[PDB]
Amino acid sequence: SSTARCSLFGSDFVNTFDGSMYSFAGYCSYLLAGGCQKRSFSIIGDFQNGKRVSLSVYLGEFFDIHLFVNGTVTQGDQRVSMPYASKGLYLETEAGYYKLSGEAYGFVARIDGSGNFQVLLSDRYFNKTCGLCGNFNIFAEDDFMTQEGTLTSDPYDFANSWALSSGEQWCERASPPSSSCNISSGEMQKGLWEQCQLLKSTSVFARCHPLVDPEPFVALCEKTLCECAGGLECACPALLEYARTCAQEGMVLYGWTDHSACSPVCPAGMEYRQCVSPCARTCQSLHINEMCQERCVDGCSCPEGQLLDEGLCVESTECPCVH
Amino acid sequence: SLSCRPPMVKLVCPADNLRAEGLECTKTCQNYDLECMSMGCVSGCLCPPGMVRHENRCVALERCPCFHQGKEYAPGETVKIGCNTCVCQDRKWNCTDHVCDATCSTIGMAHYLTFDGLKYLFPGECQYVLVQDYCGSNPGTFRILVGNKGCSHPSVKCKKRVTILVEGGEIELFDGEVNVKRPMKDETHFEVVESGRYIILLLGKALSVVWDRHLSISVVLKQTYQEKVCGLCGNFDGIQNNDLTSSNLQVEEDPVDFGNSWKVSSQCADTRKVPLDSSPATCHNNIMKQTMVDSSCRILTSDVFQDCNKLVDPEPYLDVCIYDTCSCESIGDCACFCDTIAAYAHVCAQHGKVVTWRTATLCPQSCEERNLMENGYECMWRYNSCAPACQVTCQHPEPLACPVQCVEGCHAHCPPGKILDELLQTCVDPEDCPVCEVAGRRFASGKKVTLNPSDPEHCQICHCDVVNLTCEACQEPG
Amino acid sequence: SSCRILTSDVFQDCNKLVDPEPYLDVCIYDTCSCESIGDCACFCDTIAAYAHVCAQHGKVVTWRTATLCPQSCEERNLMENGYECMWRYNSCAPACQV
Amino acid sequence: SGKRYPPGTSLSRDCNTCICRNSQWICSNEECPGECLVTGQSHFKSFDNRYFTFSGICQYLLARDCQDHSFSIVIETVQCADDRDAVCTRSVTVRLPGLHNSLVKLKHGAGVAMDGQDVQLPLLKGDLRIQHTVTASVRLSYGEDLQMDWDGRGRLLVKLSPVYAGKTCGLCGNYNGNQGDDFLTPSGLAEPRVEDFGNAWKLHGDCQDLQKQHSDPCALNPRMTRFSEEACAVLTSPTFEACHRAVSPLPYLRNCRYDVCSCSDGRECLCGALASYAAACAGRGVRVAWREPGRCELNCPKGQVYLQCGTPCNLTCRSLSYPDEECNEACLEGCFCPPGLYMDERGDCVPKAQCPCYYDGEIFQPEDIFSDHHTMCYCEDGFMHCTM
């Protein structure tokens, strides 16, 4: 292992470092991860109204980046271009999806096109980082230790303990959303129960069970298949997480999106591969090899030829020059 | 339910007595002398009247410890704070009342530590009275001064000048060495010990001075005065808030106006009231650099200082570390940083806590240039962490009144039967010393002093320059 | 001024052979940017990069004193309770040895 | 203070007076009253003008008469926001062995409770008086040698006169002038580590003693690091130029940055720390006008108006009932209303036409003719006109 993983997938949902999900429709900034005795950094996430906007990394006291789906990254308040590499924080784009690496400080963040925060974190902070993605321990039941340090039964007030406010805006205790699903039940539970079920039935998902358990994943979906009207695609967010969670454990899965009738969004020219190398051989590139022994990562990428040049796929013949 | 343990009893709120000081007022050792709140007791179990609770053990007697530094001390156990012992004779330590030797300092370029203990800020550029005795209604024995030049903004600049006026003398120092301009009458008490980094400098029974050859000025007084002085360091009374008693005999609040009263040249420049802010000139609006100095100033809270962090608060010595090196543009000499921690390390040593914090990537302080003149390389010199300051030499064979226990710096060490001389950089046997023993009695190595001024008839003088077994004749008055 | 050690009395032999005007412009470029606080190494390292090149042309130099980039060597003669002190910082000794 | 004065002048500190003669101010050495203070989160002040901090969570002693036992005060601390470095005051207890050996309790509102019983203000018993001050803050007054102040949101004060010189013991120190000894545990020795001093005055053994008092909780909340700079940078801005030469601002700045980063809502934590500085600037003589629509101007209700320096003697309607009583009060700051209007019980203030009477406690309406067999009495305009 030697690593970790958190994920804030879909709408309001969370996945800690230890197999513990819940929902949270926040209202302001909240601390994702970071030390508890002493903080060399702090990954932070801003919610506008339940729905998420920005990932932020405050590197102690002096430096700040505020990336988001908007992609218009900024440093403090001055909007900078992209990519960007100050203070040991390469701010890159991998597989058409945005990345923030802090390997000196022991973390790698990223976002996808839809907006799904992810946080990879070393084994150095085992029993350290206490926050909204919980501690990096082995257990999964005890990873609600509040900013006081208090094992709580509620996955909701916990996330509200780890709030952090600014002068631009002070924020309060958000409220749980009053579910309109409770009255508009109808047929929506009888026909659409299958898309949550196919995590368990289909063979392509029928082999991570000795590594993980889909029982929470199917539990968290059935409450979100009810607000969206007329669509099977409402299941693939909770499903899409289950793919990566098994991938991180050392056991990858293949081609599952072929029949799932849901592919994650990407810009033109590319669609969702699975296990593409991060070192995408592009156009204006030096032909060097056997340095990129990095692990294999998911994300959308170009066709077989059709090399990359400035955020699009273009045929190898039309490689430009530069001056 | 639970039938509580034998040594203590279950108690019950009576319906009549509002004063049900039961379980809520759980007397432990901390709270016994203290007074406690109680609305009503609970369904708990509680030690008897003449007994208490102690870390889950109802300790029988009133012998429980007497906490200092959050640590246990059995009754009769002793501690050493300063120059005093103190023993918890019962539940309360009663300490002695031998007042200890106070100590000024000039931490960095522009700060001052008083006797009673009061860090304050004073960037000056004129010449200033560090301390004196001529204060109101007293004779005026000694008049230590200090003089700075280009030191309102700390930098590689700010060479100090120190002029000390005692016994009608004028000895002064700057640029590495000391200089006598007027020798004082009573040469007997005079003494100079160039041990290590420092210039230890006695002047009498109740006075001493130290100088790190670069900026630090740490005058040391004895029990004798006890409110006989004034100046920048204050009055030496024990009271700490009356160390801003200006020359016009009143307490101020803004120390920049304090020192302006104590300058000598009353027509030179009074310093300017700076707008206060946590960032000096360079660090102002340069938040990046501030955090590289902040972190690097947290050596004052590091694993090696953890013993001294308990005794001596580093929050004073920290604020100076961040104040100087912001202003100071350290380029070739990182001395406006390296000197502030040694000013903390020395104070840690005076409390008996040696520290070795100085490595090769961090303020190295070699000592190898001295083991150079001799073609043979005996190399007896060493940067010893904290070695004694008052040792024996060919120039000063006797044991001296020793105001400072140990000091950092480069120190000689060769095998025994060889005693140091400073002129010949190597150590040497005892007999090679220019020592003097005339008519038997043991004394110094031929001091240049005229003994016996009291009695004319008994004027039996015996000088000794280096070794001479000589005795001069006294000129008669008649 | 402090970068004019590259034109000082001790370098006068090497100033004739190796132009210091290149190595000078770096001395002023780095230490402006560099906020030397505790380690003055972004200054002390640029002159050694000039001193070494002076040595390769056969011109040893001893420019390193106690107020200026000291480079002690005393921590090594420490493990042994006896202090033989056989280690020394000196000018320029054979880079190669057995 | 960097300005000249002619000879023969007599400037007066709060403590005493001093006179210029031959370039030498002569001065008296007569004692003057001390002031222990609690405020903000956990920021203390000793009687000897020391400052420090101790974020312990238990029932601690604050002050006590220690050669005899005329009184004893007990603070109670709790965590007060999400952070661990935020420990505000909830309630303080007072105890008077000279009267019933009673037990007063100031509560987290502006309320008080004697022996469990809630009480309407005022509370004239024999010695101790308890009354509102601005109708937003309680003020105990036992004898003439003791005062207090509100413990609702935690700004406890005291006032001890020099009759208690050096004969008290607690967190607030000896009241002996000496600023250094104040870290003297009850076991009779000066401790250097504050984390040993505060936990030496706790009252319950079950309470956890702490091990480290942190100084920069802005690390655990990096978002507030910027705001804590510009916010309390006005403390040194020349708005407070008038009382840099009255009291040292550097701690009142140091205690801001520990509060604004630590507490749940930094808005009022800011504007309850600035007032901590102005209140001490005014205690020496300098008033400051530091209120703005941005810098936390309080919202006096529509009946009242904001006011800087005013007279809380001719405000309440109880004053006209007992006009003979002395009001040796200062020129205070708060919410008053114009002189033609006097304060009613129900939040509005009214002219003296419908200002009731408080005869024998009894709140009589503006026209209530009133008599037993032998007396004859009536309430005219606030005063109770009795005859016989």
Ligand SMILES: *[C@@H]1O[C@H](CO)[C@@H](O)[C@H](O)[C@H]1NC(C)=O
């Ligand atoms: C999003 O990006 C656009 C284009 O740069 C910009 O105009 C807009 O203000 C940004 N909004 C946010 C939420 O930052």
Ligand SMILES: *[C@@H]1O[C@H](CO)[C@@H](O)[C@H](O)[C@H]1NC(C)=O
């Ligand atoms: C984790 O840290 C806690 C708190 O310091 C400690 O009590 C516990 O033993 C640690 N556990 C492991 C597995 O290191």
Ligand SMILES: *[C@@H]1O[C@H](CO)[C@@H](O)[C@H](O)[C@H]1NC(C)=O
């Ligand atoms: C301390 O108290 C003990 C016991 O009463 C007594 O014997 C001793 O003389 C006292 N020492 C001092 C320094 O007061």
Ligand SMILES: *[C@@H]1O[C@H](CO)[C@@H](O)[C@H](O)[C@H]1NC(C)=O
């Ligand atoms: C040098 O320091 C060492 C280690 O503290 C000590 O053992 C030794 O006695 C010292 N020697 C001298 C000559 O001071």
Ligand SMILES: *[C@@H]1O[C@H](CO)[C@@H](O)[C@H](O)[C@H]1NC(C)=O
């Ligand atoms: C000792 O003093 C005598 C004077 O009495 C002088 O002649 C002689 O040279 C001196 N000897 C030495 C070794 O200084």
Ligand SMILES: *[C@@H]1O[C@H](CO)[C@@H](O)[C@H](O)[C@H]1NC(C)=O
């Ligand atoms: C310095 O090193 C040189 C070259 O090895 C040698 O010739 C010389 O003797 C050394 N000098 C000293 C003082 O060690």
Ligand SMILES: [Ca+2]
């Ligand atoms: Ca966990």
Ligand SMILES: [Ca+2]
């Ligand atoms: Ca004093």
Ligand SMILES: [Ca+2]
């Ligand atoms: Ca000792």
Ligand SMILES: [Ca+2]
């Ligand atoms: Ca050669």
Ligand SMILES: [Ca+2]
């Ligand atoms: Ca005291």
